[model samples]
Target: DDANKIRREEVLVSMCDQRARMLQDQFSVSVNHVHALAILVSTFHYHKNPSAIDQETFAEYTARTAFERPLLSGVAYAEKVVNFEREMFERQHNWVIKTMDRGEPSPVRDEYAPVIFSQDSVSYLESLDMMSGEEDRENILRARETGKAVLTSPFRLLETHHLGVVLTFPVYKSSLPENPTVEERIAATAGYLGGAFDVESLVENLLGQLAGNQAIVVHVYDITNASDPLVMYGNQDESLSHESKLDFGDPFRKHKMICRYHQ
Candidate 1:
């Protein structure tokens, strides 16, 4: 019956729209967390205290924030050392540092840039040297260079070991002169703050509860280079993007985001 078909179609449309709205709502909540974490790190003086003291603060921050939000998987923190020098912020809690690179940390090198501050590693405690990884290193540098909160492309996080992306936040010491220059921003940097989230988990948590009859779905792509966008989550195919069975741009992300990985 025409009446039955029309009614079913309208119901399906309502369900799909509800699913789409729900997905967007939760995803936005997750995205807002990165900004919150950035504010915490930048405003909090975790970097100004002793290694143990700062580690405590980092741990507390991670604990209180990680699972509070349904979409977060984990969090991480690293500090920007002066001129590739590891002469600062080293200690026992960081014992795992000795296990990197063929199973033993060493000082047989130059340039100590920003490296992982593992005391706050929410997931993996391998104490992996983020600087040792190309993408991580770039985002670290980008944070200090740009002095802003940003996100990275999908890649294997050193500690979390989850295939996902990181929202990186640069923590700068307060009391800098107003309207600081790039050099000032770079010089006043303390370290990097990061939140690592599982893309699969994110999709699942955001869309899992929706009714099966709905056509709505979620997709994320890392188009750091738009020409060859790396599909980070959801469908790699664009055909299903926006998930608009109505044959139009029903709804989509109206905003954008980083180096080589941040660039």
Candidate 2:
């Protein structure tokens, strides 16, 4: 029994080390190791659908879920928002849209209406106005301070139709057990990751692989509540019409292609 116990402990240590390496690689942070215990707790919360169950039940389910789900065994999970909706879903959400042509007005005012504007957009435009070579920096600064500064000049030169995406993620606490109280657990779930890549970057990094490929629409939802949906999505195809359900690589292709993998 002593030998068996030693072997089991060795296995657990090795597994923990592996998970620590994974977190380091994904987050690019060395301090992550300090929160191993908290990560374990958060991972436990993640695997058991802690987001679904009430806080009262977390302790009972955390250990079981964390030990079973490999993908979430040593990790905390959060939603990543990539697209704008009819309304802002979270406080940390950030978005940026760019158009192909310069001097275009806000898309929300003209063509495609974005639900929200990111703070970055306003600041970027203000910087552009100050640098437009109209006057000296002191004078321009004075004009702004006097409330006579015109911010709309950049709107004439910047493109409005550019593509962008929303970014969102939650922060985790340093340790899980330190705050077992339900309120503490809920507050620990607060953190943020935000910002959108330029449309060109998105096309190259995210859409490049699927440019000529065929894809199918898949609806994702919370397993506990089938009626409450999360997202409806499919791959990008240049030829597919917005209304068409069948997404084909070629507009002329008559048959639908089967996708064996979601990615």
Candidate 3:
């Protein structure tokens, strides 16, 4: 019994270390043990009722909810906006399962669609000047044209580009699988839980809110594939140095739920 207790303790310590490593590597920030525990608890609450709330409501509630009771009391989760759109969402769901079945990122027609920044989108970002170059403008135009072509094309392009990351977690007792499919497993996770905000918009707002705050640097991670644990989306932040790498070798270490978040 004593040996078993020691072993269990060791296992928990190792898991915590691994979780810390994964968060650090992925987000480039240090997560204290307390923060990690808070995340675990908050995440647990999130999975219990994944579909209970949508993005707008979640955001409003989380902001007003007291953090003393729960780390994410006021936090809200939603499906990715791109994935919820009738045409785009289903295609992404299929791509994840299909890729898992093959154990590779196989080419699924219309799986990886180009995201076009509209004229209004570009105009709004004019203050940032990140896309002031001629090439950038041309690329935006090309993407816009491509979107139009896909809409007009005879064959539907089931694009996954806008899906962002797939976040999956264990279903609660009441939410257990009733003949679940690979598609369902991939769809139910909590990354960009709010379908309303995309990577760009969320990042912009987060940074703007923290502009003068010296205490935190937010980092976001995108897990693109469910089967292949190594792949991620978006650019890495140079300033932050925390890492959160997922170990596919260990079943427990592999993400139970696919989700992305700002760290």
Candidate 4:
């Protein structure tokens, strides 16, 4: 009985650390993605060639990035336009699964974020407005306010209906002080470097590495909003058990959840 208790507690305690590490690792992949595109962005942290901004070159780099990723995904480079057309880029993503736009097609493509660029892709120039919600606005503003790269919660893609997260790296046209104030970050802001992360695959990959159906459960939640709680993973997917349990909190998602092995 003591041995079983130890094993269960060990796995439960580990859920927080391993999950946190996994979350950070996933975000790092997104951070590196924007860094690579920062040269064409309002600034540059990684080396770049303006020549790469051209379609063929960027496409080459994109292809390389896609090959490295084990999932369908893409990146977006948008300019700092505080006021103008707001849309998600649909161009650079190579492994993207959806082939059609949802809702009514735009009367005529204007300034949507599609990646198709100047020549061929009309819809690339026009598609769904990325900043379509107050939540999205808050997420983008937070990145802008801090001049930081940040990740968004999982949401449904309007057209594809697939769940995904967005990583927005705010770029400023001008450089900031090494220890700049939030005001300065906002003042120099250009646009953003973003990556759309696939939620299902991200979780599956992170949790799938474990050996077959172990007794422990990993339940992750977002208690960031006291009123609107969200469960990111590991809830009710299996036989239910409660009344005897332990919970650990994490800086990730502001809330993480877990479980007790069956008696």
Candidate 5:
């Protein structure tokens, strides 16, 4: 019995490690989707055709791309509108710009990132100012400044009320200069490409695909902030020992995931 237990523990450890890598790859795929969408939007501008990727076209592209992507709930584009053109932007879009809570945008800010296009599933989010939400605001600004994709710390999505995270990718008015300076990045930005994911469902599905009927209970935690850890998914089995566990720091998101499993 002792020997069998040792072998079983090793197997479970291996399984847990494999799952962690799978999760990392899955997340990369989701991030790539945002990159691809950014390219599609940029292509229209490259061809000097602003109307090519209008609302309907953008909606259709997101709808189709997000359909089979397990982790992606929906995707959207938030146009960068400055204070001077706020009135014209509202007139062109036919919607009042509002905060995440649906209140009037703050007049103090010189620029606003408003959801001008969204996947059909997230149509309700259209016209929302991405900068209104604390977590999303950071990501939006970070992506714009760095000219790279940025992921928010997992939080409850406003509309779905589900624990999730949003990935924001900067969409420049044109292709960025090689090794662009911060000032250049800010100048070239046209908008942001945003994608939201239901993290619980995402992890559950991945575990189901890998674990099958294995008699294992797995828990995942986001230990990005060491002082306070958030349960990204799974249940904590206090009764189980920590024999079969692995902690991995995700390179893509620069966050730590503690995958604990017990058989």
Candidate 6:
């Protein structure tokens, strides 16, 4: 039966190749949502208009997009406001800009990134400063500096208590120079487009779709930190003989998948 065993292994190898692509595409679709929202927001708020797109429109767009792509747990827009405009912004919105703990913002910080728009499910996060958390603060600034999308390291989501990651894309003023410098980027920043993905739900749902009856054990890891990788999903299985390094095409180089025949 050794000849038949070789045939079985080949079958698994083929399955792994196809399934890996499916996993990558799952993230690809959700990542596209942030880019689309950034572009739409930029258009709506073009010319540095005094007024931004109304909450009604923002809700409608996010709701429609989330319905089509259920992978995103929530989406939001956090306006980059300066100390000079904070008072007017609070007056206009009838809400105070607060920390994640809902405390007053620090006067020492001249600029703040506050959630001004959010999907209904995550509306509670509105008015909270994105700079309150260490990881979120870093990702927010990184998104602005790079003028591209950036993903936060996985952490426990407040709403679901599930391990989650936020993808952020920078929104720049229309007049920003082409290939602008860091100073230009900082000066022209309008806001940020952010989307949350529940890593547990995302990965489990993908696994269910691809390996419903397959007799294998799978493990996924965020290998960005090589010394101490975070387990994105599944349990450790050192016996796992097949490996697939997922390519999310994201700026963050992470996520590794390994599999083995069920013992």
Highest-scoring model, TM-score: 6
* Segments of candidate 2 deviating more than 4 angstroms: 1-179, 186-191, 194-224, 228-231, 235-263
Q: What are the runs in model 5 whose C-alpha is more than 4 Å off?
A: 45-47, 103-108, 209-214, 236-253, 261-263
Model 1 lDDT tens row, 1-263: 78976775665556555555665565456657766765666555554453334556666766777665455566666665443355443553445343233445644444333335332445343344556666666777777677665556677655445567665667777745568887888777776766666766665666656556234444455555757667555544342122322111112112221000000
**What C-alpha lDDT, on a 0 to 100 scale, does residue 31 get in candidate 3?**
15
Model 6 score (lDDT): 0.79
How well is each residue in 110-184 modelled by candidate 2, as lDDT tens digits? Answer: 112122212233223211212222222232233223222111111112333233222122235444355255555
List the candidate 1 regions with Cα displacement exceeding 4 Å: 1-24, 42-52, 91-126, 159-161, 213-218, 235-263
lDDT of each: 0.54, 0.28, 0.28, 0.51, 0.74, 0.79
* lDDT-best of 1 and 2: 1
Query: Which residues of candidate 6, in runs, are more than 4 Å off?
Result: 48-52, 101-108, 209-214, 236-238
Question: What's the alpha carbon RMSD for model 4?
Answer: 6.9
lDDT (C-alpha) at residue 58 in model 2: 35
Q: Could you tally the backbone clashes for each prediction?
A: 9, 7, 27, 7, 0, 0
Top-scoring candidate (lDDT): 6
User: Global lDDT for candidate 5?
Assistant: 0.74
Please identify which of the two predictions, 3 or 6, would achieve the higher lDDT against the true structure. 6
The segments of candidate 3 whose C-alpha lies over 4 angstroms from its true place after superposition are 1-56, 66-177, 183-263
TM-score-superior candidate, 3 or 5: 5
> What's the CA error at residue 163 for candidate 6, in Å?
0.9
**Candidate with more favorable, higher lDDT: 2 or 6:** 6
lDDT of 3 by residue, 165-242 (tens): 211112222232556554543343222110111223322333334323233333333223444443222334432133
RMSD after CA superposition, every candidate = 7.4, 22.2, 17.4, 6.9, 3.1, 2.4
